[PDB]
Design an enzyme around this catalytic site. Sequence first.
Site, PDB file in Angstrom:
ATOM      1  N   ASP A  93       0.848  -1.202   0.000  1.00  0.00           N
ATOM      2  CA  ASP A  93       0.000   0.000   0.000  1.00  0.00           C
ATOM      3  C   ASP A  93       0.876   1.241   0.000  1.00  0.00           C
ATOM      4  O   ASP A  93       2.115   1.160   0.008  1.00  0.00           O
ATOM      5  CB  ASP A  93      -0.979   0.020   1.187  1.00  0.00           C
ATOM      6  CG  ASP A  93      -0.294  -0.186   2.524  1.00  0.00           C
ATOM      7  OD1 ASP A  93       0.880   0.162   2.678  1.00  0.00           O
ATOM      8  OD2 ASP A  93      -0.955  -0.697   3.434  1.00  0.00           O
ATOM      9  N   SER A  94       0.260   2.417  -0.037  1.00  0.00           N
ATOM     10  CA  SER A  94       1.074   3.608  -0.238  1.00  0.00           C
ATOM     11  C   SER A  94       1.663   4.139   1.077  1.00  0.00           C
ATOM     12  O   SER A  94       2.587   4.950   1.060  1.00  0.00           O
ATOM     13  CB  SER A  94       0.226   4.728  -0.873  1.00  0.00           C
ATOM     14  OG  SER A  94      -0.534   5.319   0.187  1.00  0.00           O
ATOM     15  N   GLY A  95       1.090   3.713   2.202  1.00  0.00           N
ATOM     16  CA  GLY A  95       1.461   4.215   3.506  1.00  0.00           C
ATOM     17  C   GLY A  95       0.553   5.326   3.991  1.00  0.00           C
ATOM     18  O   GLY A  95       0.525   5.640   5.189  1.00  0.00           O
ATOM     19  N   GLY A  96      -0.226   5.907   3.092  1.00  0.00           N
ATOM     20  CA  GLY A  96      -0.962   7.111   3.488  1.00  0.00           C
ATOM     21  C   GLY A  96      -2.093   6.856   4.467  1.00  0.00           C
ATOM     22  O   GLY A  96      -2.368   7.720   5.329  1.00  0.00           O
ATOM     23  N   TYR A  97      -2.773   5.709   4.333  1.00  0.00           N
ATOM     24  CA  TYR A  97      -3.909   5.423   5.214  1.00  0.00           C
ATOM     25  C   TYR A  97      -3.471   5.304   6.675  1.00  0.00           C
ATOM     26  O   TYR A  97      -4.156   5.819   7.576  1.00  0.00           O
ATOM     27  CB  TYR A  97      -4.681   4.160   4.792  1.00  0.00           C
ATOM     28  CG  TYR A  97      -5.811   3.817   5.765  1.00  0.00           C
ATOM     29  CD1 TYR A  97      -7.069   4.409   5.644  1.00  0.00           C
ATOM     30  CD2 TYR A  97      -5.603   2.940   6.836  1.00  0.00           C
ATOM     31  CE1 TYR A  97      -8.101   4.110   6.551  1.00  0.00           C
ATOM     32  CE2 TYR A  97      -6.623   2.641   7.741  1.00  0.00           C
ATOM     33  CZ  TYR A  97      -7.866   3.225   7.586  1.00  0.00           C
ATOM     34  OH  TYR A  97      -8.873   2.930   8.484  1.00  0.00           O
ATOM     35  N   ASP A 145      -2.582   8.582  -2.234  1.00  0.00           N
ATOM     36  CA  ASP A 145      -3.762   9.431  -2.359  1.00  0.00           C
ATOM     37  C   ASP A 145      -4.060  10.137  -1.027  1.00  0.00           C
ATOM     38  O   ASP A 145      -3.297  10.024  -0.063  1.00  0.00           O
ATOM     39  CB  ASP A 145      -4.962   8.611  -2.850  1.00  0.00           C
ATOM     40  CG  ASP A 145      -5.358   7.520  -1.880  1.00  0.00           C
ATOM     41  OD1 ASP A 145      -4.643   7.227  -0.897  1.00  0.00           O
ATOM     42  OD2 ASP A 145      -6.453   6.951  -2.083  1.00  0.00           O
ATOM     43  N   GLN A 192     -11.656   7.648  -5.803  1.00  0.00           N
ATOM     44  CA  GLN A 192     -12.215   8.291  -4.603  1.00  0.00           C
ATOM     45  C   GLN A 192     -13.538   8.931  -4.952  1.00  0.00           C
ATOM     46  O   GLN A 192     -14.069   8.676  -6.034  1.00  0.00           O
ATOM     47  CB  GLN A 192     -11.208   9.310  -4.037  1.00  0.00           C
ATOM     48  CG  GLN A 192      -9.930   8.652  -3.509  1.00  0.00           C
ATOM     49  CD  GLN A 192     -10.159   7.883  -2.191  1.00  0.00           C
ATOM     50  OE1 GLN A 192     -11.221   7.975  -1.607  1.00  0.00           O
ATOM     51  NE2 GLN A 192      -9.153   7.124  -1.732  1.00  0.00           N
ATOM     52  N   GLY A 219     -11.901   4.464  -0.220  1.00  0.00           N
ATOM     53  CA  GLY A 219     -12.831   5.273   0.551  1.00  0.00           C
ATOM     54  C   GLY A 219     -13.992   4.504   1.146  1.00  0.00           C
ATOM     55  O   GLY A 219     -14.942   5.090   1.648  1.00  0.00           O
ATOM     56  N   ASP A 269      -8.199  -7.431   0.561  1.00  0.00           N
ATOM     57  CA  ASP A 269      -7.290  -7.682   1.659  1.00  0.00           C
ATOM     58  C   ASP A 269      -7.991  -7.230   2.925  1.00  0.00           C
ATOM     59  O   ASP A 269      -8.797  -6.268   2.912  1.00  0.00           O
ATOM     60  CB  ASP A 269      -6.018  -6.848   1.524  1.00  0.00           C
ATOM     61  CG  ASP A 269      -6.234  -5.363   1.895  1.00  0.00           C
ATOM     62  OD1 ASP A 269      -6.620  -4.542   1.044  1.00  0.00           O
ATOM     63  OD2 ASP A 269      -6.034  -4.999   3.080  1.00  0.00           O
ATOM     64  N   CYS A 299     -13.347 -27.605   7.128  1.00  0.00           N
ATOM     65  CA  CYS A 299     -12.097 -26.938   6.780  1.00  0.00           C
ATOM     66  C   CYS A 299     -10.969 -27.944   6.620  1.00  0.00           C
ATOM     67  O   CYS A 299     -10.833 -28.860   7.424  1.00  0.00           O
ATOM     68  CB  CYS A 299     -11.722 -25.925   7.863  1.00  0.00           C
ATOM     69  SG  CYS A 299     -10.167 -25.072   7.563  1.00  0.00           S
ATOM     70  N   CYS A 301      -7.709 -27.193   6.658  1.00  0.00           N
ATOM     71  CA  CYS A 301      -6.428 -26.634   7.095  1.00  0.00           C
ATOM     72  C   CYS A 301      -5.721 -27.516   8.119  1.00  0.00           C
ATOM     73  O   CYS A 301      -6.325 -28.390   8.697  1.00  0.00           O
ATOM     74  CB  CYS A 301      -6.592 -25.203   7.620  1.00  0.00           C
ATOM     75  SG  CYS A 301      -6.964 -24.974   9.391  1.00  0.00           S
ATOM     76  N   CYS A 304      -7.177 -27.549  11.631  1.00  0.00           N
ATOM     77  CA  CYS A 304      -8.426 -28.272  11.853  1.00  0.00           C
ATOM     78  C   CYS A 304      -8.206 -29.783  11.767  1.00  0.00           C
ATOM     79  O   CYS A 304      -9.034 -30.560  12.236  1.00  0.00           O
ATOM     80  CB  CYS A 304      -9.500 -27.790  10.866  1.00  0.00           C
ATOM     81  SG  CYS A 304     -10.171 -26.125  11.334  1.00  0.00           S
ATOM     82  N   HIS A 330      -5.777 -20.924  10.594  1.00  0.00           N
ATOM     83  CA  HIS A 330      -7.093 -21.385  10.164  1.00  0.00           C
ATOM     84  C   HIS A 330      -7.870 -20.266   9.429  1.00  0.00           C
ATOM     85  O   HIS A 330      -8.499 -20.510   8.420  1.00  0.00           O
ATOM     86  CB  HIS A 330      -7.950 -21.842  11.343  1.00  0.00           C
ATOM     87  CG  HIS A 330      -9.405 -21.886  11.012  1.00  0.00           C
ATOM     88  ND1 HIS A 330      -9.967 -22.926  10.301  1.00  0.00           N
ATOM     89  CD2 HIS A 330     -10.393 -20.970  11.191  1.00  0.00           C
ATOM     90  CE1 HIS A 330     -11.249 -22.665  10.089  1.00  0.00           C
ATOM     91  NE2 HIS A 330     -11.538 -21.494  10.636  1.00  0.00           N
TER      92      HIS A 330
HETATM   93 ZN   LIG Z   1      -9.246 -24.789   9.667  1.00  0.00          ZN
END
Ligand SMILES: [Zn+2]
Lengths: 364, 364
Positions: A93-97, A145, A192, A219, A269, A299, A301, A304, A330
């Site tokens: 990401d840009s870092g701005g948030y 931004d 935006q 936004g 994300d 699941c 994974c 699990c 998980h």
């Molecule tokens: Zn799992």
Amino acid sequence: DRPRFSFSIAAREGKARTGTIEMKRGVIRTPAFMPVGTAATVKALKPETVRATGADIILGNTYHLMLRPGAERIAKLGGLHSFMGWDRPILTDSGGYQVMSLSTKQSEEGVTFKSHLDGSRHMLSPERSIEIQHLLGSDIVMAFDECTPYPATPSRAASSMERSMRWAKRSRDAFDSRKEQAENAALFGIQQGSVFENLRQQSADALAEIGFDGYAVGGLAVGEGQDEMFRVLDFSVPMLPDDKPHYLMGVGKPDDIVGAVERGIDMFDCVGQAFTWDGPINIRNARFSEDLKPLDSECHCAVCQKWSRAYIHDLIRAGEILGAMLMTEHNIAFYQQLMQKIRDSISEGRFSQFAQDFRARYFA
Amino acid sequence: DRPRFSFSIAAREGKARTGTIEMKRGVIRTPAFMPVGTAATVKALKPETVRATGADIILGNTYHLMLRPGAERIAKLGGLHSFMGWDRPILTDSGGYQVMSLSTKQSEEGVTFKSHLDGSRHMLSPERSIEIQHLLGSDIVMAFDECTPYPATPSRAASSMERSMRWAKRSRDAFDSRKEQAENAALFGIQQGSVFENLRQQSADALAEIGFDGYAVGGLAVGEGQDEMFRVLDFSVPMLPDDKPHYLMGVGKPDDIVGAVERGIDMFDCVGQAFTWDGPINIRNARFSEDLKPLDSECHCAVCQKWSRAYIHDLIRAGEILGAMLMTEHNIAFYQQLMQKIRDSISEGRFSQFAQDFRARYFA
Ligand SMILES: [Zn+2]
Ligand SMILES: [Zn+2]
């Protein structure tokens, strides 16, 4: 040899799409969910563990990385891929948030701010953000931004959208100024305009005229609620170029993701709660103390396969890092399985039915 | 089918021995170092990771386990092997040392104490300690004794040694009263007597008359310094039965271990510092900030294959759990490599030379 960037759409259903982004470091299946690799519990996991869940690409937070251990240090010492032990694509990401949320003096040039860690002074701008992301070596670079709070007046929404578009052009030109970055990485622009259809349209028009490899809807996920978010996506996504990826930043819960895919989004994300097909549970709750079943009985994974609800309940209540790692593994795996079900159902022309079935059970 | 317990000595050099302890759950190569599996960073590691370092057996702290999540709970839910995901031998301590160090009303019957976590009241005694260790399901059970502080007057050292021997007989009888434990687990007695040769002798005589599967030297690593510890081991170890394992509880640093093996000890445990063949380093130190080499350039561990001093320095200074896990994995691996070098050198009749060479470099 793989191209710098190629997005191919393999199948559609309504506004939903499934496909692939080919980059030099690997292929990304879309719709895609990107775990945030710069999280402590996430990095505590083996890269191999993260890959084994099905993740094709992970996200790095530029704000955190520039503050500790620093971009120049990461660079001199090998780059962010080496640092993360992750050899596939990384989006930064840009870092701005995080400047706005965690750290300020704003101007047309950029922002100066004080580290939330040691009070040291730092600066971001379209040019410096792109430079840091180059130093990190990421594959997908976000334009820098200016965020709009929610709610925002039309005048403020417009001013920040307009500044963001000026800054989008600066981001584009900075990116294009470095051969190594321009030839090997991709740049995404961010739409935006808050909840206002005309501003969203002006923003999409500006970004398409500049031209980017992909387009984020910015936004949102800032307090508006799902109905409003979905309403804004209904008109905003079709404004973006159809033939490039659409990224909804910071979204979100499984049901947000499903509804956002129904509206044309390709990439997501987000950062005691465990996800199950029957809805989220909080494993700390006393009702799980004698529950011998895994977090989710379908699941696949590694968590699990081996560990019960009862045990993870104990670990999390005791504040054990093993607990947080097991939950995180998980949850990442659950999200990748959701994305896989989404991709399959779109390819097979039964995504509408999948979304219906998913909601019926998840909210039952 | 493996026996409940068989200790076989394969080779000797001076007082040093190398051999194997065969138990139903696996073979333990001696001299052996037992990682403490009930440590947070240790359990954060995969059991497979711990095994891959070469560990044959791990230790569980009864005091911690009885307090959280509780012995009866561990039992009802599968036992400590299932809980730790470790299918090889586990040694549990009696719980008494942590009562003295972490939590009290002492009597000839046992001790009552308040949890350091929630102020709840708990009790240990030879009978209850053995019962809890049965509930955990451990393979090697420690008799419950009474610790002697350092320094201690002769009268106090004698009183606590004598009580410990009474409690050793009670521990033996409690263990022998449960078929499942008596047939499948082993019981170790603990010699006491502080720094006093006659008390150590009386203690060894009492324990040998009762009869145990192995014999710990207790009451050391409690402030006395290495010279004094070595002096006490010089006369104490030969008092114990030669044909059974000798366990030095809570020791210790690599050089302690080497000197203790030279004096007849077979088993060890202990809980920014990284061990290298050139001595310990503190990775937080600024001198490591640009150091690209691994923690130890000869270490075969997975950490040293992949990560630099510079990176681990950053993680530990930032308080990242990844850092603590990487350090712990490497340190456990270093200790297992030390034990392997010790076993090989004794088998090959060159342990004296190994000890000399080790010290020359480690203290250079
Ligand atoms: Zn799992
Ligand atoms: Zn190592």
